[PDB]
Amino acid sequence: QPAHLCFRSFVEALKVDNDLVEINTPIDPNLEAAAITRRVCETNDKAPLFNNLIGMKNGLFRILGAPGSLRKSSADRYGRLARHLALPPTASMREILDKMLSASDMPPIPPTIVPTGPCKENSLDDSEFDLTELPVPLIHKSDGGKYIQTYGMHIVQSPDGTWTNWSIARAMVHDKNHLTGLVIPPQHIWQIHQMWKKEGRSDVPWALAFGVPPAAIMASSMPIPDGVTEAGYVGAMTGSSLELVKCDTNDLYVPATSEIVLEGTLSISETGPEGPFGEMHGYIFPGDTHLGAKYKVNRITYRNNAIMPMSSCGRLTDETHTMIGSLAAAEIRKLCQQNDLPITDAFAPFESQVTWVALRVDTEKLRAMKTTSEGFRKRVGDVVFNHKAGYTIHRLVLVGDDIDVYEGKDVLWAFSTRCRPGMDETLFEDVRGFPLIPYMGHGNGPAHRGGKVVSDALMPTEYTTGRNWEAADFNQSYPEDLKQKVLDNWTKMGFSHHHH
Amino acid sequence: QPAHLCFRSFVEALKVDNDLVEINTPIDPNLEAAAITRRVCETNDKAPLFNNLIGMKNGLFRILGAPGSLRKSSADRYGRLARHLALPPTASMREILDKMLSASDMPPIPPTIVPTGPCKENSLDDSEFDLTELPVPLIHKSDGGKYIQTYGMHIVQSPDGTWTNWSIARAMVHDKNHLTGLVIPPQHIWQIHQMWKKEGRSDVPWALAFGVPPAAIMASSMPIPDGVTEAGYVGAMTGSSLELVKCDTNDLYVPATSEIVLEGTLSISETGPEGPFGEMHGYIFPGDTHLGAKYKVNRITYRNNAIMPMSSCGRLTDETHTMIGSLAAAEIRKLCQQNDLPITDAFAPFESQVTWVALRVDTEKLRAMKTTSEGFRKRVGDVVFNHKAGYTIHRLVLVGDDIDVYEGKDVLWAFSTRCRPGMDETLFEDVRGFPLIPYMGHGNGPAHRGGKVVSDALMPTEYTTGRNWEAADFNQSYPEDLKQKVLDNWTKMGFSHHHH
Numbered sequence A, B: 001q002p003a004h005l006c007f008r009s010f011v012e013a014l015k016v017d018n019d020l021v022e023i024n025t026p027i028d029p030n031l032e033a034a035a036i037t038r039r040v041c042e043t044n045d046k047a048p049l050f051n052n053l054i055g056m057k058n059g060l061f062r063i064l065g066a067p068g069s070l071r072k073s074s075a076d077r078y079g080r081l082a083r084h085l086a087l088p089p090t091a092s093m094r095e096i097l098d099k100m101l102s103a104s105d106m107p108p109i110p111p112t113i114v115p116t117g118p119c120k121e122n123s124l125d126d127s128e129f130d131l132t133e134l135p136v137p138l139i140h141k142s143d144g145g146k147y148i149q150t151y152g153m154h155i156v157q158s159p160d161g162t163w164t165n166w167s168i169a170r171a172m173v174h175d176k177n178h179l180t181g182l183v184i185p186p187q188h189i190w191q192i193h194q195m196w197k198k199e200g201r202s203d204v205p206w207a208l209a210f211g212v213p214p215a216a217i218m219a220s221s222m223p224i225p226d227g228v229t230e231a232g233y234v235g236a237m238t239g240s241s242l243e244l245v246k247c248d249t250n251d252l253y254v255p256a257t258s259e260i261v262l263e264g265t266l267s268i269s270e271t272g273p274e275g276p277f278g279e280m281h282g283y284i285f286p287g288d289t290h291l292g293a294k295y296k297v298n299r300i301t302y303r304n305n306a307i308m309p310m311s312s313c314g315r316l317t318d319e320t321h322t323m324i325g326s327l328a329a330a331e332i333r334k335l336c337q338q339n340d341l342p343i344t345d346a347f348a349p350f351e352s353q354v355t356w357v358a359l360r361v362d363t364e365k366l367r368a369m370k371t372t373s374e375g376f377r378k379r380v381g382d383v384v385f386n387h388k389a390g391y392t393i394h395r396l397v398l399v400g401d402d403i404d405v406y407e408g409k410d411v412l413w414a415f416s417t418r419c420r421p422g423m424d425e426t427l428f429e430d431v432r433g434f435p436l437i438p439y440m441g442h443g444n445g446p447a448h449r450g451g452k453v454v455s456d457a458l459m460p461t462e463y464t465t466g467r468n469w470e471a472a473d474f475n476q477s478y479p480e481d482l483k484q485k486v487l488d489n490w491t492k493m494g495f496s497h498h499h500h
C-alpha cells in the first residue's frame, strides 16, 4: 500500500529515505523514548523507531517518534510531511499546503467499506486489557499522566449520522479502561459532543485509531469546515476512496490498516483529572490539573507488531508547529480569499511559536480597493478571528508581495520595520482566545477571550501608488550584471551545496 | 602598535586570523566594492581588503569593507569586534559590552599629545585635492551621493573647549571641497553644533578621521553620556592614554595613526542635498533627498598606502547592527541599573533589525519591589525612552532570568508566548522617535514622535512568588541522569564540533 495510505508503509518510506533510526535495544517509555524524540525534534534529526519498548507485551507496542517533524537539510526540510501526502520529498511548504487545500473545491470521495484489514489481526476484550499495563509513555517529567494519545485520530459522528469527524486531541490514561483528554470549544470533537449531550440519551460512540493513513492524520490536524467529513476530504485530496472497517463493538468505521484501535464511548456526563502536559508553546505548569472529558475503552484491536506514533511536543520543532500552525494558516488563506480579501499566501512562523500568521497581500488588488490600513486590518481581523480557523492564532501580520511568508527571517524583518507599534495595529478583545498560550491561560487577563491583534506591515504607498523603496540588500541594491560578476568571481577572489 | 590602538595593525590582525581576503586586482568603487562587501555581510564571510581600487591616486585610497561584521562560526562570531578591543576572538557579546561599559566608573585617562604620526606622512592642501576625483564608493545603486563617510570619526568640540566629541554620522561628497551629512537631534554632533550656532560667530572647527584606533571607533558608535569626551573614556577602557596629533589647519587633535584625516569646518548656516542612503533597517527610498549639514574640507592628510574603512550597510548583518544596536543596548543596561531597575543584561536582537532591546530582569529583585506589570513597564519605558540612549529603540521586551537575551530565538520565544498583545504592553507616543525606521519617517504617523512600546514578557508570578513553569524542552523536561544517558548513547544509537 502506498505510504500516504498506510502507516506501516510510511515507516518503510522513512527507512528508505535514510530518515529513520531503528533502536532495537530496550528503551523505557518512562521519559526515555520521549527524551530521545525531544532531542530529535530540537535538532531536526532522523525519526526514532523504538522496536524494543520496556513493557511491550503481546504485540502492544513499538513507538515511532517525531512522525511530522523537520529534516536537517533545507532541500528536503519538509520531507516527512511530503511523505504523508505522496509528494516529492523536496516539496515546498506552499506545495504541501496547496495539496491540503486541494479537496476544498472537489466533490468528496466517500470511503469504501471492506470486511477486514490489518487492524483486526489481534484483539483484546474488556477482560483482557489494562491501559495501565501498556508501555504508554510519560512524555515530560511533570506531565499529569501517561499520554497515550498524541498522534492518533478520534472518530465521532453526529447523532443524525450525517457528519463523521476525524481529529487529533490529546488524551492520557486515567485507569485500566478509561482515558481523560481535552474536548474544548470550538473544536469539532466538542461540537459533536455537545450535540449528544443535548440529546441526552447516551454517551457518544467513539473510536481512537493510532497509526492511521498519513494523509488522514494530516486532515485530522486541519480545521476543515464544520460538517465536513474528513474521510471524504482525504479521499478527494488523494484521488482514492479510503478503505475502512467497522468497529467490533460499535458502528463507527476505522481505517483498515490502523496500527491500534480503541473502541468505546466519550461520556456526556463524567469527567476526570487531565493534565498538565508539556505543550506546543514550550511550557508545562506543574500541578495545573483540571477536569477533562472521560473516555471508556471497551475493546482494543491492533496489527501484528503494532507501532504507536508519538509527538514529544514542546519547544521547536515538532508536529504541533509543523502541522497545527501550517494547516491553520492554509485554512486561513482560503477563508480570506473566500471573503474577497486579496491574500495570496499564509504561514505561521515557527519563530512566533506558531502564534502568528503572516498573510501575503496581492497589493495590486489592494490598491484597487482604495482602502486604508485601519479599515483593512479591521476587515481581516473580523474575518479570521471570528472563525474557528483563527482559533490558535493571536497575531496576524499583513505583508506585501516582496515578502516570502514561508521565510521567518523575512516576516520578522517586515514586522519590525514596517508596522508602527500601536498606530498600525488593531486589537481584538471580543473574540475567542486560545487559552493554552501562557499569556492567556496563565496571564493577566481572561483566559478565553481577547488578546488578539492585526499588525499591518504594509507600507502606506502599498495602498495607493505602489512600493516606493528598494531593499538595501545584495539582490535589490546592485544591477544584474554586477551581481552575476560578483558571484562568478566569488571563489576566485578567496570567499566561500544545495542538497546538503 | 596593538590592533586595538592602530587600524593598520587591526588589518594585520584580521589577516593573521584568516579573516581577511585581499583583492589585488582592480575593483570599481562604483558599486562593485560595496556589492562584494554586502555579500560578505549577508553571508558572514571574511572581510574584503580592496588593494587595487579603480581611481586610487597618490595613495588615496584602498578600502577595507565589513570591519565590524560577523564571522561564520559560532565560536568566534564576534571576533572582529573583539579585535577592536584587545579581547580574545572567542569573547561573548556580554564580555564585549562589559568592556565597552567598563570606563563608566573609571577616571578618564586623557589623551597625550605627540608631535607627529603616520597620519602626517602625506598632505594635500586646498589647491591639490578634489573630493570628486577620489575613489569614493557608490554603496547602493539608488544612493543620492558617494558616501565617503561610513566608518570614520567626526571630531567637534564645544565652544568652551571642555567637551570633545567623537562619533560616527554618515556623510557624502557634495563637491570638490564639501560634504553633506546628517547632523540630527539628539546626537552629540548636533548638540555641539547647536552651541556654535547659538554663539553665532563662526563655523564649527571639525575634523573627520578615517581608520582610527579600533577602540576609538567603537566608542564613537556608543551613546556614552552628554559632556563626556570619548578620548578619555577610550583611554580608561584600554588602560592607556591615546596618542593624538594636532590638525594642521585647526586646533583639534586626531589619532596619530589615523589612515586619512579631513580638516575643515561644519557650517552653522549652510546646508545641501543629502541622501537617500541604504540604511540600517534594510531600505532605501529612491529620490528621498533632503537638506543636510554641510562640511567644508580645507586639508587632507593621510598615511602612505592609506586604507578607508567602509560599511556597506543594509539588511543583516553589518556594523549598523553589531555596533549601533549592541552598544545602545549596553548603555541602556547601565541606565536602567543607575535608575535602580533590576536589569541584568540588554541586547538588541538582530531579528528585530535592532529596533528592539530585550532586558533581562533579576526577578528576585523584582519580587522585592512588590509591583505590577503596568507600573513596572511604565517606569522602564519612562527611563529609557526619555533618554538619548533609547533613541534608536522602539520596543523594549522585558524577560525573566531564564532567557538569554543574546540569543534571538529565546527572546522571540518569550515575546511570543509571555506578552499578551495590548494588555501586557504600554505605548509611548510622547517620546522622541527614530525617523529612519520606515514605519516612522515613511509611515502613517509623525516621523519624530511616538511609535514606542514596552512589551512585558514577564509572567504574572515573576512579580509575586516566582516562576511556576518548566520548559517543555530537552533541558528542563527530563532529569539530569537521563539527559546524560541520551547524550552518551546518541551516536551509538544512530543519530548525528564547537569550533567549526
Ligand SMILES: Cc1cc2c3c(c1C)C(C)(C)CC=[N+]3c1c([nH]c(=O)[nH]c1=O)N2C[C@H](O)[C@H](O)[C@H](O)COP(=O)(O)O
Residues within 6 Å of the ligand: A149, A150, A151, A165, A166, A167, A168, A169, A170, A171, A182, A184, A186, A187, A188, A189, A220, A221, A222, A223, A224, A311, A313, A319, A320, A323, A324
Ligand atoms: C497535530 C496535533 C494537533 C493537536 C494536538 C496535538 C498534535 C500533535 C497534540 C496531541 C500533541 C497536543 C494537543 N493537540 C490538540 C489539538 N487540538 C485539541 O483540541 N486538543 C489537543 O489536545 N490539536 C489540534 C487539532 O488537531 C486541530 O485544531 C484540528 O483542526 C482539530 O480538528 P477539527 O477541525 O476536526 O476539530
Ligand SMILES: Cc1cc2c3c(c1C)C(C)(C)CC=[N+]3c1c([nH]c(=O)[nH]c1=O)N2C[C@H](O)[C@H](O)[C@H](O)COP(=O)(O)O
Residues within 6 Å of the ligand: B149, B150, B151, B165, B166, B167, B168, B169, B170, B171, B182, B184, B186, B187, B188, B189, B220, B221, B222, B223, B224, B311, B313, B319, B320, B323, B324
Ligand atoms: C556604527 C555606525 C553608527 C552610525 C552610523 C553608521 C555606522 C556604521 C553609518 C554611517 C553606516 C550609517 C549611519 N550612521 C549614523 C549614526 N548616527 C547618526 O547620527 N547619523 C548616522 O548617519 N550612527 C550611530 C551613532 O554613531 C551612534 O548613535 C553614536 O552614539 C553617536 O555618538 P554620540 O553619542 O557621541 O552622539
Ligand SMILES: [K+]
Residues within 6 Å of the ligand: A166, A167, A168, A219, A220, A221, A222, A223, A224, A230
Ligand atoms: K480535522
Ligand SMILES: [K+]
Residues within 6 Å of the ligand: A418, A419, A420, A424, A456, A457, A458, A459, A460, B439
Ligand atoms: K504599516
Ligand SMILES: [K+]
Residues within 6 Å of the ligand: B166, B167, B168, B219, B220, B221, B222, B223, B224, B230
Ligand atoms: K560616541
Ligand SMILES: [K+]
Residues within 6 Å of the ligand: A439, B418, B419, B420, B424, B456, B457, B458, B459, B460
Ligand atoms: K506578560
Ligand SMILES: [Mn+2]
Residues within 6 Å of the ligand: A165, A166, A167, A188, A223, A224, A225, A228, A230
Ligand atoms: Mn473536522
Ligand SMILES: [Mn+2]
Residues within 6 Å of the ligand: B165, B166, B167, B188, B223, B224, B225, B228, B230
Ligand atoms: Mn558623545
